[PDB]
Each structure stands twice: as C-alpha cells, then as structure tokens.
Structure 1
Amino acid sequence: GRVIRGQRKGRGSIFKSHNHHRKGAAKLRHLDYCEKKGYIKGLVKDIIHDPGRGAPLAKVIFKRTEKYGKKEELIIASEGMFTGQYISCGTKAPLSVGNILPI
C-alpha cells in the first residue's frame, strides 16, 4: 500500500496550523516576586478575537516594576470581564471574576 492520510498528517507540509492572523499565544503573566508575594493590577484595554479559537482574548497592560514602562499580555478572557477594569494577579489579590490567584 501507500502512506495513509493519518500518517501524512504528521509530516507537517500542508497540515500546519493556518495561523497567519492569530494575535499571539495565550499565556499568563510570568511568575515574579510581586505576583508571588502580593497583588499586581493590570488593566484589560481591549478584548479581541483570535481567529483560530472561539474564546476571546484580552489585552492586559501591566506596568513593569523593574523598569519604567508597560508590558502587554494576551490572556484568555473569562466570561464577564470588560475593557477598562483592573485585574489583579498574585497571592494577596482578592478573589473575583477574572482575577488570577494561586490555586
């Protein structure tokens, strides 16, 4: 016989993900001393749609603590969050819809 469709899938010639319009990988804020020992609040500026997935993403702007400036993170949005609110990340952050907490 010949190589079947399932086996051809793994070669990655035409079966690569069509990801030309994706807005970025959905990753949480990288662990930090501030997030390990308290809350840090970043504001979600805009909820966008990632073409690959169905769940909308959120563009959360945090302010970096080691340098002047801001860092933008792409975070999978929970049902009920809106642009302009501050979302809190860390151990001491209060529990609420959208907040990121240690489990």
Structure 2
Amino acid sequence: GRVIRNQRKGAGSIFTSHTRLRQGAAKLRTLDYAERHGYIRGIVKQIVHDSGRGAPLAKVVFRDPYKYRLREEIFIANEGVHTGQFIYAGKKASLNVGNVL
C-alpha cells in the first residue's frame, strides 16, 4: 500500500499551523527578582481577539526594572478583567481576579 493520511501529517508540508493573523504567543512574564520577592503592577491596555483561539487575549504593560522603557506582555484574559485595570504579579500579590501568584 501507500502512506496513509495520518502518516503524511508528520512531514509538515500542507499540515502546518496558519499563524499569519496570530497576535503572538500567550505567556506570563519571565520569573524575575520582583516576581519572586515582591510584586509588580501592570496596566491592561486592551482586550483583543486572536485568530484560531476561542479565548480573548489581554495586553498588559509593565515597567522595566533595570532600564527606562515599557515592556509588553500578552496574557490570556480571565472573566471580569477590563481595560484600565491594574494587574499585580509576584509573591506578595493580593488574591484578586487577574493577579498572578
């Protein structure tokens, strides 16, 4: 016989993911000194649709501890999170929806 359908998918020619319209990989912040000892406050800028993903995404901006600029993080939005909300992430963050602990 010939190579069956499920075997052909591993070659990844026409079976790759369609990622043109993706907003980006959804990840938390990199575990750093502020996260493991205290907390750092971020601001939700917008909640946007992501192609190929049912759940919406949230854009949260944090300040860079070690140099003067802003850092952009892409989170998966929980129910109740709204634009303009402050997000607290770290070991000493409060127990509220949207906080990372």
Deviation at 1:24, TM superposition (A): 0.2
| Structure 1 portions without partners, runs of 5+ | none
* 1:42 counterpart letter in structure 2: G
Q: CA RMSD in A?
A: 0.6
Matched residues, number: 101
Deviation at 1:69, TM superposition (A): 0.7
Aligned to 1:71: 71
Distance in 1, Cα, partners of 2:76 & 2:95? 17
Aligned to 1:2: 2
Aligned structure 1 segments of 4 or more residues deviating by more than 6 angstroms: none
Deviation at 1:79, TM superposition (A): 1.0
Deviation at 1:70, TM superposition (A): 0.5
| Structure 2 portions without partners, runs of 5+ | none
Given the two structures, how large is their TM-score scaled by the length of structure 1? 0.96
Deviation at 1:52, TM superposition (A): 1.4
Identity %: 64
Distance in 1, Cα, partners of 2:95 & 2:69? 27
Aligned to 1:42: 42
